[PDB]
């Protein structure tokens, strides 16, 4: 019945949460995998998530189908788009909740781009996916990324706050949003999200491992549930060491 | 069978009606919530509606799902769009009548933008929602907001009158429209709406509490069923006192 | 089985037909109602149609649902658009044949705009509606109004003729088209309609009552089944009187 | 099972075929009916087809529904557009295979415009119609008319050849294409069509009847199954004479 | 259950694979068939595939339906577009997995154009097709061709790599991508494809047969499963002899 609660049981048993994000292959393509070549291998990602004690991984259906082994809770990211694309931002489902269920997913993921000239297309589709999520008792995790239209600065405190509120209004049981850069403004985003837990979208690799930790601590001060981190772990050679330190910070 | 009657029974037992609108989170975003921070909390809105003696609240499905507790009749607002959006005005359903039913809604809401380059998209979708509203015996409340195309002044008396008529034509069992600024032109809108009750869309916060009371006054003079108010209540620090003021005005009782 | 015959039996028992059109509330808005304020009231329209001895009324579903009382045969106009709209002409269904049936309609109506950039959109939807009309045994009345694309003069004899032929080709059991201004060219439109009866679209209120009556005689001379009249009746203060004059002319 | 064979059995019992095309009322409008006024009457067209010994007629659903009497095999042309239209060429179905079946059709017809900015819309819809044609055991006749995009000269030999091949690729059981003007290049179009029989699209009424009869002779020797002729028969005052001379030539 | 394995069993019994591609009739049209006229005949293609000992053929549904005889495993290419088309690249299904099954296909094929302004349209459709492929136990082969948007050089190593990764992400069980021109960059594409086998898209006729075989060599060094070759076999007057050479090289 309560899907936020189901999400928390599964992805935040310790009261905070670290998700290893891995939809990069479609969203950005494989170029970033070159810094740490093993990252192109989804098997490595599963081992990495498990060895670091993380709460979950995010796979596109193709990766889930060919590689998922049940060893770490899965969020199946249902839509995806490429950076090669030049239109108004849009990302459509390449899979379904029902198929995610049969692949052993514990939750489903969907990106919206509020403000886009295609914002309606994603809301329309989200309606079906939200309905399916409830039907299959799978928490819906919304990546809420305002982009297009009037959006100029994506990390502006008013834009991140709008992102968080939109996700709540649309039925998200958990959400993933960009960091504002400082914990005071980010906590307003966290507040307007209400009962719905907020994960920080990790983003591009930071100059040092130190800068990222400082961000993560900011996020926690603000009251977020934790982080959904991709590049900033698996793009690094010392992925597991750095992952473990992310664990110590977030969990203890 | 008669859904306007069902709406009136539920949302206007006293013969007039106040609805506490709260779809703002999606439509405008959370910035407005800063003036009175508790307004960001839907639990506060439910208490506020109940404590003021209001007839209902309007929630988007997400808020309804996570917060609705059955303590005040609910209109589930089915579609929503953002102000970040720049195209021809369009607002698509993010939920369904069937789901609204299971969330305890007593009515459903839907916005149309007559005149928009996308007007057909909303009419197309309203056809399905209207059919579902009848099927689930849930009154359909239409927010009728002419915008785009030839519309320049939204509160023009001819535009508000068109808005009211369009809602009636398309099957609204109750409607919500912008005020013209004066009761004589607004009553023409109310007249062309015929059997379908008209609620005034509250709008942006007025310089003073009494500016808004004067508007409501005129709205009642015109023969409207009442008001769907959002900001002008919950953006104020003294939301209950002022809500209670509106309640004295609208339910009168002389 | 034969829907044109069903239409004639219901809407033309006297061998000719007058329909009181009342979809104007959506199409043009309520400004026209100001000349004769009672016309804003659909109850007045029903009384007017009945007292004049007319054959039917045309309502949008909202008006049918709230006001229709079975006292005059109903054509439920399925689609509608506004004059506030600025794009390529398009009008989509806001209701269905199945619902019209349950509201006591005796026929359904649908506008197409041949030549529009959106002509395909209406043809696509007409396919579904025509199929439904046959299924529910409800005659389909097609308002055939070439507009957009290459159309410059809507009352041009070649354009009205095309309009009439398109309606026949697409499955209309009865049609409504604009008058050419003279009975010679209008009778070519009537001729290309073949077995499908043609009603004249009444149009904007004429300078004098006699101007209109003379158009109606032209229409009848050309072999049309009659008129679908709106404003030219209900926009006048003497609606019933003038309606009764129209009845004497058309029914004989 | 084999629909090309069923087509040949019904529309080419003599081993060649003449189809009397009559979708012109929607495609071009009724202006061409003026040269020979009876041609506006579908009843005349059925008599004409039968009296000339032709194999079939092509009707839009409206004309089929109101006029078809089972006296000559029918190809129900499913889609139609107008010349008033100005956008990228598109023609959508205004009817269905299932309804065609119930109207006594022996085959169904569908136009595609390869190259059009809307080419995808027609291929999408063709998929459904092809599936339906197989399901109802009704041969699919594809009018293949490259238009829009890069197409400048429609009767260019490479364009007509492309048109033929596309029809074969998409599932046509018989096809209708424009003549190149000479039997050498037209027989390459016929060759790339493979097992799928090719009918020449008749086109605008030729200056002189011999001008048409020659096209016919070149089409036949190029190895086409025959002709789908409209205006070049029914626009003529000597309609039945020419049709009977067209027959003697096609059937040998 | 495992569709990649089913694909390998059927199309790569020898551990490597040669597919004879023949969707060109729609994609490019019949002009290329002129160099070796027998190539226009699908019967010749089947004979050619079989006599060369190849693993399969790719047909569009129309060709499969009229010509497929079960003599060589079939991949039914579900979507197709023309070169006459000028818009943002898009190719929609003209057929279905269910129909492919009944035509004796052993796999289904679908093209995506990542980067296109219409990329979402194909991802949307791929979702349905992928689901159908799993349901009917037919391996999905994805032609992954970045085009439109930001794509300028299609054979750029980063673009081909992205192509490969997207195919994996979306659920491809085997994929077909363009060669980079050198085996070092092509093997990065092969690596990011992970468990999903990669076939080289053959492409346009090479200046010399030698140039083609050295590209094939490259492809094999890079660790690809083999080649999907069309024009480079069947456009050659000595098709069979050269095909029998391609065999020798690929299978050892």
Curated annotation (Swiss-Prot), chain B:
The keyword Transmembrane does not apply. Its EC number is 4.1.2.13. GO terms for cellular component: cytoplasm. It is found in: Cytoplasm. Pfam families: DeoC (PF01791). Changing residue 143 to E: Loss of FBP aldolase activity. Substrate binds at residues 23-24, 28, 32, 143, 147, 176-178, 201-203, 230-231. It is an enzyme of class 4 (lyase). Activated by citrate. One of its GO terms (biological process) is glycolytic process. Keywords: Cytoplasm, Glycolysis, Lyase, Schiff base. It catalyses: beta-D-fructose 1,6-bisphosphate = D-glyceraldehyde 3-phosphate + dihydroxyacetone phosphate. One of its GO terms (molecular function) is fructose-bisphosphate aldolase activity. InterPro entries: Aldolase_TIM, DeoC/FbaB/LacD_aldolase, DeoC/FbaB_aldolase, FbaB-like. The active site is at residues 145, 176. Belongs to the DeoC/FbaB aldolase family. Homodecamer (dimer of pentamers). Catalyzes the reversible cleavage of fructose 1,6-bisphosphate (FBP) to glyceraldehyde 3-phosphate (GAP) and dihydroxyacetone phosphate (DHAP). This is Fructose-bisphosphate aldolase class 1. It comes from Thermoproteus tenax (strain ATCC 35583 / DSM 2078 / JCM 9277 / NBRC 100435 / Kra 1). The lineage of its organism: Archaea, Thermoproteota, Thermoprotei, Thermoproteales, Thermoproteaceae.
